[PDB]
Amino acid sequence: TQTVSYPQLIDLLRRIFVVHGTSPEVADVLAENCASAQRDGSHSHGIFRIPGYLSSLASGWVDGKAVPVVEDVGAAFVRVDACNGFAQPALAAARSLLIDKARSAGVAILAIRGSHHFAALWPDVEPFAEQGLVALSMVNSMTCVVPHGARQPLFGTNPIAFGAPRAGGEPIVFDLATSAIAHGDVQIAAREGRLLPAGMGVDRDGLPTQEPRAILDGGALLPFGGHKGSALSMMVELLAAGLTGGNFSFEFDWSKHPGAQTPWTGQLLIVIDPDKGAGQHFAQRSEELVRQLHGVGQERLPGDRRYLERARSMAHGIVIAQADLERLQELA
Amino acid sequence: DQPTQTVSYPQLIDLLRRIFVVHGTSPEVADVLAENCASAQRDGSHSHGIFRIPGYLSSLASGWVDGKAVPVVEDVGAAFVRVDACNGFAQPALAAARSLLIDKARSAGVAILAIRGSHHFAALWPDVEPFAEQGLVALSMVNSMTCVVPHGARQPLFGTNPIAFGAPRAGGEPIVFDLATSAIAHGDVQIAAREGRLLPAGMGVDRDGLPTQEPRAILDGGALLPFGGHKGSALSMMVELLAAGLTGGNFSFEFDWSKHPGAQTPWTGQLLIVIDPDKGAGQHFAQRSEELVRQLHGVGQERLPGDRRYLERARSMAHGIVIAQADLERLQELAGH
CATH class of the missing domain: 3.30.1370.60 (Malate/L-lactate/L-sulpholactate dehydrogenase, NADPH binding domain)
Structure with a gap:
């Protein structure tokens, strides 16, 4: 796992967005946003979102x-x-x-x-x-x-x-x-083969389930706090x-x-x-x-977790798997 | 069982207005609170209807x-x-x-x-x-x-x-x-305690921080949990x-x-x-x-959201507001009747 600085990550992501058709202005905004998420430990909203950003841009959606x-x-x-x-x-x-x-x-x-x-x-x-x-x-x-x-x-x-x-x-x-669980976390549980606690969602037939795959396969999520x-x-x-x-x-x-x-x-x-x-x-x-x-x-x-991670990122840099860094570089 | 009676919405407003005036509020305050309290009762918001009159009065009497x-x-x-x-x-x-x-x-x-x-x-x-x-x-x-x-x-x-x-x-x-934002409204905990019944579980704890369904345990040194976590x-x-x-x-x-x-x-x-x-x-x-x-x-x-109250509201306006005979007599007495 290589370490990149916050500003380095921003420049890298900005390049990616520019390469994929965004205006320079949009690239600056999104690069900073995505990099900030990574910096603060919001992985589900950080570099992990790049593929979705690009696939959405590709069709003109x-x-x-x-x-x-x-x-x-x-x-x-x-x-x-x-x-x-x-x-x-x-x-x-x-x-x-x-x-x-x-x-x-x-x-x-x-x-x-x-x-x-x-x-x-x-x-x-x-x-x-x-x-x-x-x-x-x-x-x-x-x-x-x-x-x-x-x-x-x-x-x-x-x-x-x-x-x-x-x-x-x-x-x-x-x-x-306002859903009991974020959609991104359901996909994660699916990939990691983890069950969800009760009350997060239902399957395609409307029945309660703990299987994240069932929720994703035509199922749905429930609202938090009923x-x-x-x-x-x-x-x-x-x-x-x-x-x-x-x-x-x-x-x-x-x-x-x-x-x-x-x-x-x-x-x-x-x-x-x-x-x-x-x-x-x-x-x-x-x-x-x-x-x-x-x-x-x-x-x-609320927020304490992110501020602590933010401090770490600015002091030791943002740690990213070399695999992800290389592909980001290729996308750039 | 307590025999009940019915009071029209306007009658209840007049009754509560008199109570507030007799107990020291300005006419403006009495008009506002009487309509508010009566409206809650009309809509079935029991925790904040006439149930609150005694508390309103003791708070006023204390100078609080x-x-x-x-x-x-x-x-x-x-x-x-x-x-x-x-x-x-x-x-x-x-x-x-x-x-x-x-x-x-x-x-x-x-x-x-x-x-x-x-x-x-x-x-x-x-x-x-x-x-x-x-x-x-x-x-x-x-x-x-x-x-x-x-x-x-x-x-x-x-x-x-x-x-x-x-x-x-x-x-x-x-x-x-x-x-x-509490699991259950504090006011409903009081209603339960008054009616001497238990609450559903998972909404509060006692003075020792242990789960409880006894409203009195929550009210006396206990606490409520925030909804949804x-x-x-x-x-x-x-x-x-x-x-x-x-x-x-x-x-x-x-x-x-x-x-x-x-x-x-x-x-x-x-x-x-x-x-x-x-x-x-x-x-x-x-x-x-x-x-x-x-x-x-x-x-x-x-x-x-709101349908439950609109249904009760319609029922109250059509058949009148249901009130325990004892409660109506108490309100009438407080008004001077």
Whole structure:
């Protein structure tokens, strides 16, 4: 296993995206995102995703050269047509305007439509929290989750992410799928020949199963926390698709695009200046919550795992199997 | 068995209004709380219906909560409103800022209402429903008193911390959900303890951190578990940060009513986010949500979030609100009858 630096990995991935038809702008954005995921130990969202990115680009399913169109529609509202491109480039195109609105008006919404999101969600909220703002994001994906009480899948894994600043450390950030398990983890259990704990999914006949292969072979996933996670998943469909103008998780398919791996939906982001007109400092309040959490026994705070891995990567470099490095080099 | 009686929705509102006025609230506060409490009862939200009257009254009598507080509405940004509830209830504070909040939401596209120094002793869905009835999307969060053990922790810290959501649909009543981030709502634990029955397992623990189904064991030194596991705990933390951290109100563990015998209302805060889903849009949100409803029925989800309450609501308006004879007589006495 060879070791590559964070910036080295970025340049390598950027080359790959350029070679496969993305614009230089899109390549920069995706390379950094993917490399950041690897740096933080989010393997399921790191270099592991490259093949899926490229297979999706190959058919034109997702446009690696799309130019986001920003629409300033309100003192606290921004819409962006991702134009069948990735979501990250669209978010980047409107980020400055979004932050200006959030700081001026107190809160602002960014509604991205017609976008493909193939990464972790925490990278999208983290930057806002690093700048002292609170951010909430939702992205609906592709049909595979059975709504509570239903007999067939409808919702996507539909993740929700949240980021908030704290005076004494890195941002408090969490990113969770509303399904009981992430789709990527099901494939892993399948490859590793591992069974899943009860309640993660059902087979093609709608019967409970622990066999990841059964879930993948025409089966489906269940919502986390039963009716509660299901309600939250419905909210994600309504906010990331219904409000943005993008497709619901069931309003598109890959039947005409061999190799397509990305959902073609949308994304909602709500950015808030927690201290707008406040006689206190949110960051001090959150730091106190952290202190109290440690006090009752919670050793790890949401995000702690990634920050520790991040520190390791910046100090000793990112460790990657020579096999993967060579192929990435060949793709480059 | 306890013989029952029926009271119409308007009759119950009048009765509770009298109770609040007789016990020291301003007429504005009485109007707001009477309608809120009666609405919960009408919808079958038993944990937050008339069951809360005794607690409302003992909290008022102890001086813990100010029933005549006048909310101070603070216009702090084009899309941001804060309200100092002045140690009063949350609902009257929300009512005082409602018009301004809606104006900002429609004008700017989205707006936030940050209530601090408030007491919330009710269901959360009543707070988002009105916005959805008017074509807006609303999200709200409120924290309570400490009762939930964070994931991986040994002692309780978070409150029951519910999250509520309301959205309009072109062909029906608003889609609304109101879920506690605790495995079971704290209020339902109290109901179970009152009715002397056990709870389903896997929702709480006793003072020793051991599994229990006895509501009294949870209420007396015990604790509740976050729903769904680690994910529910993360959402509960978010509620503390949004309802208290951002508003200026106390976190669930930052208030003590030991000096106020009878105090039962959490003194914290509340966050509300109201959105015009169609701001600058080239489509209609209500049509999209109605399509989602159609698809949900198509895959087999017979009941949509909110349907349970709408069914009870219809039953209450048609046959009246069922109430234990003893409870009705108690309310009538409290009103002066």
